[PDB]
Amino acid sequence: MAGASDRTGVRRPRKAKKDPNAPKRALSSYMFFAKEKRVEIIAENPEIAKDVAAIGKMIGAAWNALSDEEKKPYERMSDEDRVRYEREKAEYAQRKV
């Protein structure tokens, strides 16, 4: 929240022009249990909270959901086939909020 009264024009993270700078990683494999709550971030990041296009882009992003360095072996990105069910939840909770 702006209004720090320290600078000449303190900007806020709510500004649309200001990038979200948030994590776009997929739900862990085994940690999926806890990582499943990642969908909650939808609130902390109201910038893309209304990402209606994310639903259509999720397709090509399905492969870019996991880490790149771990996407080479295709061992992680592959196992995502399961967590993918919980991962999609995030983009699902966004369309609403």
Backbone CA torsion sign across 54, 26, 97, 17: negative
Place of tokens 């090509």: 60
CA 87, CA 39: separation in Å to the nearest integer? Answer: 8
Distances (CA, A) of 88 to 59, 81, 92: 10, 11, 6
Domains of the chain and CATH, by start: 18-97 (1.10.30.10)
Give the method of determination: NMR
CA 29, CA 78: separation in Å to the nearest integer? Answer: 10
CA 84, CA 62: separation in Å to the nearest integer? Answer: 8
